[PDB]
Design a protein around this ligand. Sequence first.
Ligand SMILES: C[C@H](N[C@@H](CCN[C@H](Cc1c[nH]cn1)C(=O)O)C(=O)O)C(=O)O
Ligand SMILES: [Cl-]
Ligand SMILES: [Zn+2]
Length: 507
Amino acid sequence: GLEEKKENKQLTYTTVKDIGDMNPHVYGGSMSAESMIYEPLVRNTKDGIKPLLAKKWDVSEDGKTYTFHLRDDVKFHDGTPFDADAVKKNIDAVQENKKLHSWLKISTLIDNVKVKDKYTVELNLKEAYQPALAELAMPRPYVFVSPKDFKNGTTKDGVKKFDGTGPFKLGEHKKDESADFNKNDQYWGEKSKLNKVQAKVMPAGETAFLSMKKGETNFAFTDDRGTDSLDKDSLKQLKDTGDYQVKRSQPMNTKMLVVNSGKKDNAVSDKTVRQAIGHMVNRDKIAKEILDGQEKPATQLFAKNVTDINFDMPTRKYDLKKAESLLDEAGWKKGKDSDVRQKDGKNLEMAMYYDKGSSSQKEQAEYLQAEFKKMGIKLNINGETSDKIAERRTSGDYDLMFNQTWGLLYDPQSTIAAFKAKNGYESATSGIENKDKIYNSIDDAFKIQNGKERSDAYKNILKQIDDEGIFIPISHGSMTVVAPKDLEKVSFTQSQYELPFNEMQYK
Ligand SMILES: C[C@H](N[C@@H](CCN[C@H](Cc1c[nH]cn1)C(=O)O)C(=O)O)C(=O)O
Ligand SMILES: [Cl-]
Ligand SMILES: [Zn+2]
C-alpha cells in the first residue's frame, strides 16, 4: 500500500507502455526512463546551459571547436570509468548512424572528436553553430552508454547492457509488466532519496485507477507520447481519498490532428478535402466540453509565445458551410437520395488513428466521427498503441492521426526540422506540391542569425503548411503528475519527457 511504499522509499508508477529499447542512441525507448539512467555533457535549463558530465568548456574563436573539461569522479553503472575516451566512442558511435539523427542539425556538422587528455575532449564542427550546446543537452542521442556495452564498438544495432552514469540503474525488467530503476549508490551528483522507482505496465482507465486507489501503484505522469493513464474524474477521486496530490506543468505543446498529404489512395491527398476537414474541428467545444476546460484551445501549431514565433496566424475556423462548399468543389457531393458523400462511385471514408491508452484522444475521435457522419463522411477510428501510431507516422499508413508537438526545448525549430524527417512528420508533408521549396526554406531558416528575420522565415514556412491543411491544432497540452500527498520536490524541467526522480523525497 501507500504507507509501505513511503516507508520503503519506493515509487511505482502506472503506465500503459513498457520501457522498450533502452539504448539511447536510438529513439524507441521510454524518454523518462532513459533520463533516469543516462546523462548528457550539459543540461539545458530555464537558466540556460549548465554543467553536468562536463564541468566547463571552451569554444574556439571561429566557433568550430568545443573543448569539454570532464568531471573525473564519474563511473558507469558497470564500474568502468567515464572519461574522454568514453565520450569520443559514444559520439563516434552515434555519428556512424547519423542518417537517423539528421533531424538534429549538429549531427550534420560534427566533423570529428579528439581526446586531448584523460578528462579533456574536443569536438570539431564543420562550421560554427550556436545551438550546439543545446542539442548536446538533449536526452537522445548524445548521452553516454558504457563502451563495454557496445557491440564490436557500435551502438547502432544495439547495446549488450544498459549502463549509464545517471542517478538510477536499470534493474529487473519483466517485459510488458514492470521495470525497476534502482538508486545508484555510486552516483556522482545529487543521489536519489528514493531506493527504487518502478514502471508498472497496465491498461489505462479503470485498471490504472484501481491500481492507484489501493496503492499498488502510487504515481503517474503523462508519458512521452502524451498519454495520461487517468481521466479528470479519476484524478478527482484520488485527490478525494486524502492520499494523493495532482500537479500540472505550464502548457508545453500543441496537440493536433495530422492529415496525410502523402496518402495517395485516399481523399486526404486532395488539398481541397484537407481544407474542408480543417473547418470540421470544433476546437472550442472540444477544449471546453471534451477536455473539461483543462487545456486551452490551439488556433495555430506553435503558440504566439513560443520562441521565435511571436505572431498570430489563426488557422481555419469551425465552419461546416465552408466545409460543405469545399467538399462540393472537390466533387465529393451528397445526393437527394442520401446525406452521404460520393465521388466516382466511391463513398468518402478515412481512417483515423489514436492512442487507445488516451481517454481524451478516444473521446475526441468519437466526437469527430459523429461530426464527420453529419457531413456524409465515414470516419473509421482505430485505437492502437502509441508504438503502432509512431510506426504509422513513419510509414505513412494513415489518413488522420492524433499527435502532438515536442515541447519547450524542441518547438519550433526541431519540430519544424521534423516536417522533413522520416521519423517525424515527413509522411504528412510528402504530398505537398511545393515540398522541395518548403524543405529548402526549412534548411535556410536555421542558418538565419537575426531573430526577427528567422521568425519571418518560420512564418513563411508555417503559412504554407497551414495552407496545406497538414496539421489541425486542437488544444495545448501540459504534463500532469499524480503523486503521494507526502512526496516533496515533484517539479517540472523544460521537458515534457523527464522528471526529477532523484530529487523527490517523502514527508
Ligand atoms: C528523433 C525523434 N524525436 C525526438 C524528440 C521527440 N519525441 C517525441 C515523443 C517520442 C516518444 N518516443 C519517441 N519519441 C516524438 O517523436 O513525437 C526523440 O525521440 O528524442 C524520434 O522520435 O525519432
Ligand atoms: Cl494557439
Ligand atoms: Zn521522438
